[PDB]
């Protein structure tokens, strides 16, 4: 099944701080950063070649206004919220995320949620056409939003507008989004304090999902192994490392197994 996602996230901070923008919005298509706005540049800018090549000035213009609109809204929201919590100052954050997922061309979900100081505040339930108040302080917001038919406005965006544009973005960047790049894998052993720590690093793979496992004598061994998870490179590719603890001089018995879309069969690597 062909899955595609459009995700916008938005951050408003009272304490960015030094030389940093207090308001930042970015967008992702299939997990890949493609647009960016902040309170410093006050303009939307491309983050991938495919959106840079396919979008016209009217697009960037159109987005910049909504961006500047959102900046002003969250500037006020910061103020509105600290007064609601009877706060006078300090470090605070407003976070929004919204977007949609499509499957085989059709939408399967749409979300719209915000957090205050890193915790759930309100979230759109498109099903019951209702905003869920996560904390008592959010009830006034829940009420006024439903009062002004915000559910109808966001149902419209999440089911029509978001979907329509996601389909466009997917077409624009189909070639780059659907590419596969091999990882470069290195296995490295280091012996200290009576323990042979074997590490396996996969460098520069795309897309993001990957499984890296340790095998001892051909058997999957997830006992003394630890994973750093999947972390980004600067160039849109990804990285991951997994370690396992073994006995001194016993390295030959271990293989690193890498499962990735770029590989027809799992890769096997040794020290």
């Amino acid at each position: 099944m062909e899955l595609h996602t459009l995700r916008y996230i938005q951050t408003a901070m009272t304490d960015p701080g030094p030389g940093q923008p207090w308001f930042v919005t970015v967008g992702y298509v299939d997990g890949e950063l493609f647009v960016h706005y902040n309170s410093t540049a006050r303009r939307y800018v491309p983050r991938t070649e495919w959106i840079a090549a396919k979008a016209d000035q009217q697009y960037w213009d159109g987005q910049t206004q909504i961006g500047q609109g959102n900046e002003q809204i969250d500037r006020e929201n910061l103020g509105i919220l600290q007064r609601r919590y009877n706060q006078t100052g300090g470090s605070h954050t407003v976070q929004w995320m919204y977007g949609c997922d499509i499957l085989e061309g059709g939408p399967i979900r749409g979300y719209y949620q915000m957090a205050y100081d890193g915790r759930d505040f309100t979230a759109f339930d498109k099903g019951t056409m209702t905003f869920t108040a996560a904390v008592p302080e959010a009830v006034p917001t829940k009420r006024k939003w439903e009062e002004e038919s915000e559910p109808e406005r966001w149902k419209n965006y999440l089911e029509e507008t978001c979907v329509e544009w996601l389909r466009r973005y997917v077409e624009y960047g189909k070639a780059e989004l659907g590419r596969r790049e091999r990882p470069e894998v290195r296995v490295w052993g280091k012996e200290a304090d009576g323990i042979l720590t074997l590490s396996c690093r996969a460098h520069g793979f795309y897309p993001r999902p990957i499984v890296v496992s340790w095998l001892k004598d051909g058997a999957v061994r997830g006992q003394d192994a630890h994973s750093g998870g999947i972390v980004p490179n600067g160039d849109g590719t990804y990285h991951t490392w997994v370690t396992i603890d073994a006995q001194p001089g016993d390295g030959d018995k271990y293989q690193c197994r890498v499962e990735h879309a770029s590989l027809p069969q799992p890769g096997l690597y040794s020290w």
């Binding site: 916008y8 938005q10 919005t25 967008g27 159109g62 987005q63 909504i66 961006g67 609109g69 959102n70 809204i73 969250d74 006020e76 929201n77 509105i80 919220l81 609601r84 929004w96 919204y98 915000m114 006034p140 917001t141 009420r143 006024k144 939003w145 915000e150 966001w154 965006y157 507008t161 978001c162 544009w165």
Partner: peptide, 9 residues
Amino acid sequence: AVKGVGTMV
């Protein structure tokens, strides 16, 4: 395409 978020109360 983005959209304007809500105003808090």
